PDB file of C-alpha atoms and ligand atoms in Angstrom:
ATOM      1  CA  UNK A   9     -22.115 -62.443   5.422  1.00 55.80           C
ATOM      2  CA  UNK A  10     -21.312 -61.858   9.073  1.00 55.07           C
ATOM      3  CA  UNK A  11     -18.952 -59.071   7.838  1.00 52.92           C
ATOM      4  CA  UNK A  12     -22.443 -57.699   6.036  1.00 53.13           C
ATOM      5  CA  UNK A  13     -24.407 -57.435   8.743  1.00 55.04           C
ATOM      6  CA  UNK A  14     -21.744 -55.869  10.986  1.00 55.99           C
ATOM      7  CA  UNK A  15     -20.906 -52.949   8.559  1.00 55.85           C
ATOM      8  CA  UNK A  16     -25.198 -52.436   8.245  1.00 53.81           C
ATOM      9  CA  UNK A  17     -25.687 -51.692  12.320  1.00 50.98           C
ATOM     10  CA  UNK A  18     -22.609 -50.055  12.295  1.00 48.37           C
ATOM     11  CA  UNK A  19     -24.330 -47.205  10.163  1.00 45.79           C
ATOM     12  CA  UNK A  20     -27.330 -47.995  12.614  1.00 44.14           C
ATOM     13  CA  UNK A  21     -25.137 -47.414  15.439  1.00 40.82           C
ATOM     14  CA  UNK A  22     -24.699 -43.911  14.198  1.00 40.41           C
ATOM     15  CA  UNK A  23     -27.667 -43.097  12.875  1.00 42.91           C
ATOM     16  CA  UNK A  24     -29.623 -43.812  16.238  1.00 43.56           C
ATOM     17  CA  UNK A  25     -26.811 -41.947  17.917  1.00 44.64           C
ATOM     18  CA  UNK A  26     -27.663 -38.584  15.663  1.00 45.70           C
ATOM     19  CA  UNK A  27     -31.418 -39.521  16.284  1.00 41.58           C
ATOM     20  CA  UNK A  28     -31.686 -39.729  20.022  1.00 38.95           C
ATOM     21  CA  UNK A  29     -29.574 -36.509  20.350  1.00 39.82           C
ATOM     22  CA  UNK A  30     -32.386 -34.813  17.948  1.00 39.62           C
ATOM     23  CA  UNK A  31     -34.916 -36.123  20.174  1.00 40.05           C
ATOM     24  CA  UNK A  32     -33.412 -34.749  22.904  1.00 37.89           C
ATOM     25  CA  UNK A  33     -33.230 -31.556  21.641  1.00 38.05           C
ATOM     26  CA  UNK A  34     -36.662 -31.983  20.531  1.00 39.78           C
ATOM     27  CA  UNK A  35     -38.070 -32.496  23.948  1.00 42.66           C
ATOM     28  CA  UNK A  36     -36.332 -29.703  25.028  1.00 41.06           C
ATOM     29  CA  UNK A  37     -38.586 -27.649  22.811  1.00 45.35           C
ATOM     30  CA  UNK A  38     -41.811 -29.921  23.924  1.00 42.84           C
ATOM     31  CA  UNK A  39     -41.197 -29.553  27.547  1.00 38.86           C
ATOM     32  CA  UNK A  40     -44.840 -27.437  27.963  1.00 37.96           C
ATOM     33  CA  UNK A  41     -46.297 -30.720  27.479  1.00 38.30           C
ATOM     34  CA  UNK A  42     -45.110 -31.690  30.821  1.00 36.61           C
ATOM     35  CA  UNK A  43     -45.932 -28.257  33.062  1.00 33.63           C
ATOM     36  CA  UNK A  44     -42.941 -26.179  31.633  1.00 34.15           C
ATOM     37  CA  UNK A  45     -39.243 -26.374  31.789  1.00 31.59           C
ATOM     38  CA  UNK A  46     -38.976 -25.923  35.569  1.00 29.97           C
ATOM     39  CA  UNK A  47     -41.700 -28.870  36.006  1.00 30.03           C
ATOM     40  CA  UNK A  48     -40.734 -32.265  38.024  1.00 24.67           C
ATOM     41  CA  UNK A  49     -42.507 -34.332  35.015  1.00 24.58           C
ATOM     42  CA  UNK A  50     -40.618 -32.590  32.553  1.00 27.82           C
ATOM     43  CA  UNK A  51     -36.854 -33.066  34.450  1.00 29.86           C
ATOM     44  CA  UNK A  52     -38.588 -36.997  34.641  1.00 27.54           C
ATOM     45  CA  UNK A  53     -39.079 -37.437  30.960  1.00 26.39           C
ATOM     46  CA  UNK A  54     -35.639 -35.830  30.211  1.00 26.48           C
ATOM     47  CA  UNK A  55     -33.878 -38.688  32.239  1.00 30.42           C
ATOM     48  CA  UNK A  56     -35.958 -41.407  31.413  1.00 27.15           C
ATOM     49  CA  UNK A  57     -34.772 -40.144  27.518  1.00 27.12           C
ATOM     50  CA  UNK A  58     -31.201 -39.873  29.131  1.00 24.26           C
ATOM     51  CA  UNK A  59     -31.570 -43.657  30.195  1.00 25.43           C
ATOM     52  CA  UNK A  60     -33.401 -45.172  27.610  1.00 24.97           C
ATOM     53  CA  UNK A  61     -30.953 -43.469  25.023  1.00 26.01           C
ATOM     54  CA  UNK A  62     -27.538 -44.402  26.793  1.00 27.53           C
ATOM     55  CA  UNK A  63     -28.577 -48.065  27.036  1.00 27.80           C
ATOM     56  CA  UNK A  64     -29.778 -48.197  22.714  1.00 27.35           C
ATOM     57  CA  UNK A  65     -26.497 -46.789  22.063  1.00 28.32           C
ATOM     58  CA  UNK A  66     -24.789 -49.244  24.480  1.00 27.18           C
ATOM     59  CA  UNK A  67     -26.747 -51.908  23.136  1.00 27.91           C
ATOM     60  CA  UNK A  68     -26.263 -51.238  19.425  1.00 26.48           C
ATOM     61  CA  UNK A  69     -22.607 -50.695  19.906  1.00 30.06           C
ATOM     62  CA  UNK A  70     -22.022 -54.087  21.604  1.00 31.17           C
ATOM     63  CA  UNK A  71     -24.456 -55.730  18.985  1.00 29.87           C
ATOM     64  CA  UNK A  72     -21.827 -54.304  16.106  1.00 29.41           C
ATOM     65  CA  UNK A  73     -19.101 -55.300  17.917  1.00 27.89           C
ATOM     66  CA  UNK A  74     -19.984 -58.939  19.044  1.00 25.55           C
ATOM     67  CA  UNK A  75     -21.249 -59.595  15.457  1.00 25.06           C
ATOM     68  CA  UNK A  76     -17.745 -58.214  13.640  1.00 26.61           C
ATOM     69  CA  UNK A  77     -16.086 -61.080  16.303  1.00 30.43           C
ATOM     70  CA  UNK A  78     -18.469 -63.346  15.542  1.00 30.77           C
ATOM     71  CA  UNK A  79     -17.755 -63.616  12.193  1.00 32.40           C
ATOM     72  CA  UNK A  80     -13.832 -63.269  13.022  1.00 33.01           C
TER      73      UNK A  80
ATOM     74  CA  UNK B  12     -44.723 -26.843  20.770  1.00 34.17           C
ATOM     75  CA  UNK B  13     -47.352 -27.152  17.634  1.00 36.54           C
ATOM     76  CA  UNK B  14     -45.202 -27.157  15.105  1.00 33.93           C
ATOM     77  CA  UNK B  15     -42.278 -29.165  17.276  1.00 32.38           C
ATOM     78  CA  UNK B  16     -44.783 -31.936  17.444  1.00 34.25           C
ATOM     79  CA  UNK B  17     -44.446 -32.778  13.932  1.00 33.39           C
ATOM     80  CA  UNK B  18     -40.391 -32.805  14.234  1.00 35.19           C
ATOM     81  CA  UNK B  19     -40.721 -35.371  17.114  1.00 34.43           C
ATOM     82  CA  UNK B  20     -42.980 -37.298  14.758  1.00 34.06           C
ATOM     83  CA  UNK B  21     -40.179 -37.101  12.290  1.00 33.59           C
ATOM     84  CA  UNK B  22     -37.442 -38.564  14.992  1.00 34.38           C
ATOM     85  CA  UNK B  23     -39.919 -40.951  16.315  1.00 35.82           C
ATOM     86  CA  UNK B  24     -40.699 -42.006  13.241  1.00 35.72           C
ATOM     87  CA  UNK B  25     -36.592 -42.487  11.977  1.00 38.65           C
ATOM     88  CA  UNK B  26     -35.831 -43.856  15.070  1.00 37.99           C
ATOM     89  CA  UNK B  27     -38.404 -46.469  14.510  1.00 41.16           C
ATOM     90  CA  UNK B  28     -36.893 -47.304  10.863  1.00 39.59           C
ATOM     91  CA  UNK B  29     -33.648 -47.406  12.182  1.00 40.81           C
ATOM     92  CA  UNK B  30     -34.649 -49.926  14.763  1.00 43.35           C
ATOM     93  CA  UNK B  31     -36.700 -52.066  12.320  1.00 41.79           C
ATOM     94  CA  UNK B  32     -33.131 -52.136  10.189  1.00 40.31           C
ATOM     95  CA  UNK B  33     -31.185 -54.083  13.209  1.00 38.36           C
ATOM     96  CA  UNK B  34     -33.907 -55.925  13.961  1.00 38.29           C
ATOM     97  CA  UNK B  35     -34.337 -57.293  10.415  1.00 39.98           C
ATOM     98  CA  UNK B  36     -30.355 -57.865  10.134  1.00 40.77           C
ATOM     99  CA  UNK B  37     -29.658 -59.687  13.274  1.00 37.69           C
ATOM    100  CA  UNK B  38     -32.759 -61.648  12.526  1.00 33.22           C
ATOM    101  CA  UNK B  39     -31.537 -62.907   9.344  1.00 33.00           C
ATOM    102  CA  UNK B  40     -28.223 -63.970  11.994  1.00 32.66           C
ATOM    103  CA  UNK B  41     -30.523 -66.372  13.634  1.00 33.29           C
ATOM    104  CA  UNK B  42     -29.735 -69.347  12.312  1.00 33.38           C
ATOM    105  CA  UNK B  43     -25.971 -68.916  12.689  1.00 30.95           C
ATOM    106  CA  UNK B  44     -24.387 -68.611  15.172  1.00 29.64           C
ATOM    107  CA  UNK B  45     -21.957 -71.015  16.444  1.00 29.24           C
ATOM    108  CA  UNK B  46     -18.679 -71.172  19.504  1.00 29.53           C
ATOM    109  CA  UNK B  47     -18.565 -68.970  22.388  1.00 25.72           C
ATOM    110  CA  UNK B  48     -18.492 -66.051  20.365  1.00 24.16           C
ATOM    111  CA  UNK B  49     -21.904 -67.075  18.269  1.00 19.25           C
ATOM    112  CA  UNK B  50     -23.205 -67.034  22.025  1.00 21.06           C
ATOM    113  CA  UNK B  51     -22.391 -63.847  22.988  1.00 23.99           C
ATOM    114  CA  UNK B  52     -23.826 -62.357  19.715  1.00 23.56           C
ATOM    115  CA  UNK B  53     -26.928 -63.748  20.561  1.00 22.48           C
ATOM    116  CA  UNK B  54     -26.811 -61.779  23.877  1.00 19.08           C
ATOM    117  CA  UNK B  55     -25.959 -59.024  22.389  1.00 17.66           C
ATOM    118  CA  UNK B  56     -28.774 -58.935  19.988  1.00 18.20           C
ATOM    119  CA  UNK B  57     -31.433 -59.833  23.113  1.00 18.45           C
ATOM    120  CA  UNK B  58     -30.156 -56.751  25.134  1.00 18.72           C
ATOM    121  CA  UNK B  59     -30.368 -54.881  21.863  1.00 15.50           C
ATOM    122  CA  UNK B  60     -33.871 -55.826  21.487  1.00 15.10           C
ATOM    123  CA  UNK B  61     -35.015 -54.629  24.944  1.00 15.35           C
ATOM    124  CA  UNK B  62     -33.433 -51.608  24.858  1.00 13.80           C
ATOM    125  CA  UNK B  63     -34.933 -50.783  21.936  1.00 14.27           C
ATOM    126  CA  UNK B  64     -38.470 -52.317  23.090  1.00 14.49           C
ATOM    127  CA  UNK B  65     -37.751 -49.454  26.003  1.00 15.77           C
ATOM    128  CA  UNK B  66     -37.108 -46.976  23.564  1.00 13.69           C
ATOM    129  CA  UNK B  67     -40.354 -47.471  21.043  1.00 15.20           C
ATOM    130  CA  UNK B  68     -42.028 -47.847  23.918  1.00 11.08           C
ATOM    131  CA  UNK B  69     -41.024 -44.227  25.714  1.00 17.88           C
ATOM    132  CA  UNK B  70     -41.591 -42.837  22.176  1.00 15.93           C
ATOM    133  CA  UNK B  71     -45.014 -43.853  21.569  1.00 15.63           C
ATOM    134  CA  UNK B  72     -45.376 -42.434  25.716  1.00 15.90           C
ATOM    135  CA  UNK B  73     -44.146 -39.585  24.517  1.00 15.67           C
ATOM    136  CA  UNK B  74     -45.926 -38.829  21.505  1.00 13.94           C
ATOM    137  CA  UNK B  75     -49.653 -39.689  23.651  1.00 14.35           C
ATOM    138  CA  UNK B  76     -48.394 -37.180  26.253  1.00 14.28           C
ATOM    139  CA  UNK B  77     -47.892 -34.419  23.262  1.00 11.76           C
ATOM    140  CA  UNK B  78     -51.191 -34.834  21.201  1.00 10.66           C
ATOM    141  CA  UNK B  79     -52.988 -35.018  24.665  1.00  7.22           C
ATOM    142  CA  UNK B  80     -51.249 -31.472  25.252  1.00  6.39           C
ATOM    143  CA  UNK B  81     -52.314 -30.412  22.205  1.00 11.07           C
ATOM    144  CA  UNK B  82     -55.858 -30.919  22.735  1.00 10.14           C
ATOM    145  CA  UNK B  83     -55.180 -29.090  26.241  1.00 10.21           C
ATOM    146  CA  UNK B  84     -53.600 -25.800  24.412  1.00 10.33           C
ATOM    147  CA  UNK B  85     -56.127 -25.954  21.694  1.00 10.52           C
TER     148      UNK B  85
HETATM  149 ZN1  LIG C 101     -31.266 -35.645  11.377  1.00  8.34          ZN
HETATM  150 ZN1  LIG C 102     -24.230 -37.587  20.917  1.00  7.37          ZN
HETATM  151 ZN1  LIG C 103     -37.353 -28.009  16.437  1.00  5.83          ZN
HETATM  152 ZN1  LIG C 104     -36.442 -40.379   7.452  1.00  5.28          ZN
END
C-alpha cells in the first residue's frame, strides 16, 4: 500500500529529473524568445527554471522518502 | 526556435503527466496517515504540491512567451 505508492514517485522522482534537464536544454535552444542568448530576460528565465526545477526535485525526493518511512 | 517549440510542448506536456501521477498517488494517501511520521508525509506532499504549482505555472509562462515570439518572427 504505502510501499506502492513509494516505489510509483520514486519512478516520478526520476522521470521529472530527466524532464526538467530536457527543458533546460530546450530553453537553451528557445532563448530568441527572450532577446537572444546574451539578453537579461533570457539569463532571468534560465534561473527562474534553475529554481523552480531544484525545488520539484527536492520536493519529489522528500515526498518518496517521507512516504517509504511512513509506511515503515 | 520553430521547430524547438514543439519539443518544449513535448516536455511541458510530460512534465505535466508526470506531475498529475504524484498528485493522483499521494491523493489516494489522504486518508492515511497516522504518528509523527504520517505528519511529516503530509508536509511533504504540500511542499510537493507547490513546487509543482510553481513549475506548471512557469511552464504555461513559458510556453505564452514562445507562441507570442512566434507571431513576432512570423
Ligand atoms: Zn526524454
Ligand atoms: Zn540532472
Ligand atoms: Zn531540440
Ligand atoms: Zn510522453
Amino acid at each position: 500500500g504505502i510501499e506502492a505508492a513509494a516505489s510509483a514517485i520514486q519512478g516520478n522522482v526520476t522521470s521529472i529529473h530527466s524532464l526538467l534537464d530536457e527543458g533546460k536544454q530546450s530553453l537553451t535552444k528557445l532563448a530568441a524568445a527572450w532577446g537572444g542568448s546574451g539578453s537579461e530576460a533570457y539569463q532571468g528565465v534560465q534561473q527562474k527554471w534553475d529554481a523552480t526545477a531544484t525545488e520539484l526535485n527536492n520536493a519529489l525526493q522528500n515526498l518518496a522518502r517521507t512516504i517509504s518511512e511512513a509506511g515503515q | 526556435l520553430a521547430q524547438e517549440a514543439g519539443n518544449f510542448e513535448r516536455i511541458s506536456g510530460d512534465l505535466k503527466t508526470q506531475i498529475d501521477q504524484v498528485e493522483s498517488t499521494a491523493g489516494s494517501l489522504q486518508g492515511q496517515w497516522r504518528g509523527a511520521a504520517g505528519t511529516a508525509a503530509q508536509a511533504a506532499v504540500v511542499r510537493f504540491q507547490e513546487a509543482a504549482n510553481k513549475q506548471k505555472q512557469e511552464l504555461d509562462e513559458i510556453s505564452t512567451n514562445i507562441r507570442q515570439a512566434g507571431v513576432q518572427y512570423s
